[PDB]
Amino acid sequence: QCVNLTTRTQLPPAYTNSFTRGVYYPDKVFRSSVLHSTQDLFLPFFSNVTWFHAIHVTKRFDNPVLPFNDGVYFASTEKSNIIRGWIFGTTLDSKTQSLLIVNNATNVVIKVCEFQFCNDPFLGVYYHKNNKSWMESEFRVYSSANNCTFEYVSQPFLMDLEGKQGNFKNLREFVFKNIDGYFKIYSKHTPINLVRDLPQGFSALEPLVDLPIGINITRFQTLLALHRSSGWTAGAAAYYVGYLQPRTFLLKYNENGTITDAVDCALDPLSETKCTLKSFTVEKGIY
Amino acid sequence: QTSNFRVQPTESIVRFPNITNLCPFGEVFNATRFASVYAWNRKRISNCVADYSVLYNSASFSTFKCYGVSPTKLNDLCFTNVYADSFVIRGDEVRQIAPGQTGKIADYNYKLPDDFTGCVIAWNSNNLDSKVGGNYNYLYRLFRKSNLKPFERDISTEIYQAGSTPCNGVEGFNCYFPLQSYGFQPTNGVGYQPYRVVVLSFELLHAPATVCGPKKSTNLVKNKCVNFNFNGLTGTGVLTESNKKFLPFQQFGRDIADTTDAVRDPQTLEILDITPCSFGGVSVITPGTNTSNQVAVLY
Ligand SMILES: *[C@@H]1O[C@H](CO)[C@@H](O[C@@H]2O[C@H](CO)[C@@H](O[C@@H]3O[C@H](CO)[C@@H](O)[C@H](O[C@H]4O[C@H](CO)[C@@H](O)[C@H](O)[C@@H]4O)[C@@H]3O)[C@H](O)[C@H]2NC(C)=O)[C@H](O)[C@H]1NC(C)=O
Ligand SMILES: *[C@@H]1O[C@H](CO)[C@@H](O[C@@H]2O[C@H](CO)[C@@H](O)[C@H](O)[C@H]2NC(C)=O)[C@H](O)[C@H]1NC(C)=O
Ligand SMILES: *[C@@H]1O[C@H](CO)[C@@H](O[C@@H]2O[C@H](CO)[C@@H](O)[C@H](O)[C@H]2NC(C)=O)[C@H](O)[C@H]1NC(C)=O
Ligand SMILES: *[C@@H]1O[C@H](CO)[C@@H](O)[C@H](O)[C@H]1NC(C)=O
Ligand SMILES: *[C@@H]1O[C@H](CO)[C@@H](O)[C@H](O)[C@H]1NC(C)=O
Ligand SMILES: *[C@@H]1O[C@H](CO)[C@@H](O)[C@H](O)[C@H]1NC(C)=O
Ligand SMILES: *[C@@H]1O[C@H](CO)[C@@H](O)[C@H](O)[C@H]1NC(C)=O
């Protein structure tokens, strides 16, 4: 069943700067104390990424449509995990194959079918009175499925769902790419207790799983949790989206096989010099 | 300096991933409830590595009928999708499963096109089929007014009218009637001895093609210059035990020279080592042929 939300506040999107974030292992090769350089799809250092706010204030909501470039970097700041899942496709009207990934209190679903999506897909969790528990009472993301190719159910995941207004408890970083009919997802989960201005430091994104699909993807749309207790209690969750470009990076593997540093070879000419000598320290002279 | 010296490999260990998970396709072949020829069954199965040597040596299959595809090479082939079916064909109509025929249900029910690989196999059915009295629930086509085409479905849930007489709930002399029943005669010849048949179709199209076949795995050897054929990697060397700590997802191992030197075991998840096996140059030492005729060899 398809519905829509009314009486919502609209706000312009903001911009924020990526402070050397978005590094992931491009290969499955172990290295020890090496300065290997590679040219792949990456997120350039020190650039705008757009910022959408899902604050409850008054009655503000956000769920826009963003085109899918060659790669997507999704950085969510969460306290009670309001954000749940994503949908990928071109038309999103059951006329073409489309992917849907959700991880709810029930079993995790990764399903590439034809779904008749609604104008405002969402998930609705009700705060019942007979027991003080939150259970999913509204599945209105799409109408129905017709005929499919690849459906997968992962292990069930249990996580408390509440509408809170506190500081973000954790950060979830995801990188989505689509090459050679393969959908590759790189995931990382980190703890922090900040409010904005994403922390410094380098955090490599380990790969999670690869999905063989082989479909066009030019548009993606995320979905939230619409709690019930008219009223929706959207919370104050935040998520950032960024796009990837072909860039050459210099990676420094430690003794354990874990990436600890990287240098973008498109920044100020000092970075170019560091990218030529294959070292992080350059002495005086002319190069 | 005289020549060079090299050590040849002996074994060809071919270790692959651990185990195939499952493929319930055999269950599709081996259930208890099935429809008739009127049901153009089409069961699509993908992302499943399935055993094929079982069908070549099974219990009561016998009538193995594949078309112009080599029988042996298809077990170790990898495709994108497979299709299934099940119904009763009444003995001699085994001839109708051919690449192009129109005499009978070869085109009436479960139409098969020409140049369609579709390995087909049937078996004798004397207890499930040819039952006592006759289970007339099964139906076969009367005339097939659908006028099918290669790879089409004949679904005629209505009745004929020739040119004059409507037959909408009225006994029409020219309106004929729906599909005739199935004469499961108790004990008779091939003309009254039904058979149950199943077809396995293949199609590649353009996809990642994650429907592969089973692969073997030989035991490993250590401390011996042998030929190794790990997943993707093919080479020669001596495999021993190392002490490097790998990440829970990395599989390969490289160095500054970008040459593979450590392989993770796909079965037991153990980190090995790679080293060339004792190549060198041989040289002789002589005190001068005038004084004596003795030599010493330096390796
Ligand atoms: C890939 O498939 C193989 C084949 O099934 C599988 O190997 C077997 O795994 C099971 C567990 O899944 C092993 O069972 C136990 O394994 C533990 C840990 O390896 C062993 O320590 C146990 O055996 C010990 O105790 C025995 C009795 O005291 C001793 O006789 C023995 O030597 C050990 O000390 C126990 O068997 C099973 O042993 C292995 N079999 C072999 C031949 O390795 C493997 O686990 C699968 N791997 C993956 C990643 O799927
Ligand atoms: C890299 O791996 C090594 C593995 O040895 C880690 O070394 C550990 O160091 C701490 C320091 O007190 C010891 O208590 C541990 O016992 C060591 N590990 C082992 C297995 O003995 C090291 O921490 C890892 N990380 C880095 C950055 O070197
Ligand atoms: C169909 O089901 C029958 C059950 O009677 C299977 O017959 C035996 O099944 C077991 C278990 O797989 C095998 O170990 C035996 O070898 C089978 N008997 C014979 C004579 O082969 C039969 O294998 C099943 N057919 C399938 C699974 O294709
Ligand atoms: C992001 O916004 C615009 C680009 O359109 C630019 O003026 C601004 O400087 C950018 N941000 C930073 C930190 O440079
Ligand atoms: C799948 O769904 C579409 C939409 O109705 C339909 O046109 C198509 O024939 C179906 N089957 C296949 C194999 O694509
Ligand atoms: C995906 O887009 C390419 C670009 O033209 C097209 O050639 C291909 O047919 C598309 N695949 C589909 C629609 O499955
Ligand atoms: C070999 O050595 C002896 C040592 O006395 C010498 O007399 C002789 O001439 C040598 N041979 C030749 C061919 O010079």
Tab-separated table of C-alpha atoms and ligand atoms in Angstrom, chain B residues 26-27 29-30 54-55 58-61, ligand 3:
chain	number	residue	atom	x	y	z
B	26	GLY	CA	17.396	-33.508	-7.603
B	27	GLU	CA	14.401	-32.962	-5.331
B	29	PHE	CA	13.273	-34.756	-10.132
B	30	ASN	CA	12.195	-36.966	-7.269
B	54	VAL	CA	24.936	-38.415	-10.594
B	55	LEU	CA	22.565	-38.300	-13.573
B	58	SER	CA	21.674	-43.137	-11.229
B	59	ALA	CA	19.087	-45.642	-10.021
B	60	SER	CA	16.320	-45.877	-12.636
B	61	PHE	CA	16.884	-43.127	-15.212
C	3	LIG	C1	15.291	-40.400	-5.217
C	3	LIG	O1	14.920	-40.882	-3.924
C	3	LIG	C2	15.379	-42.226	-3.687
C	3	LIG	C3	14.855	-42.636	-2.330
C	3	LIG	O2	14.551	-44.023	-2.290
C	3	LIG	C4	16.907	-42.312	-3.794
C	3	LIG	O3	17.315	-43.672	-3.692
C	3	LIG	C5	18.496	-43.793	-2.864
C	3	LIG	O4	18.840	-42.532	-2.264
C	3	LIG	C6	19.986	-42.589	-1.402
C	3	LIG	C7	20.148	-41.210	-0.804
C	3	LIG	O5	20.480	-40.250	-1.798
C	3	LIG	C8	21.211	-43.041	-2.191
C	3	LIG	O6	22.320	-43.164	-1.308
C	3	LIG	C9	20.937	-44.377	-2.871
C	3	LIG	O7	22.039	-44.734	-3.698
C	3	LIG	C10	19.669	-44.294	-3.716
C	3	LIG	N1	19.372	-45.582	-4.321
C	3	LIG	C11	19.848	-45.954	-5.513
C	3	LIG	C12	19.445	-47.319	-5.985
C	3	LIG	O8	20.572	-45.222	-6.183
C	3	LIG	C13	17.389	-41.732	-5.118
C	3	LIG	O9	18.809	-41.638	-5.139
C	3	LIG	C14	16.806	-40.345	-5.323
C	3	LIG	N2	17.229	-39.791	-6.599
C	3	LIG	C15	17.940	-38.663	-6.706
C	3	LIG	C16	18.287	-37.979	-5.418
C	3	LIG	O10	18.286	-38.214	-7.794
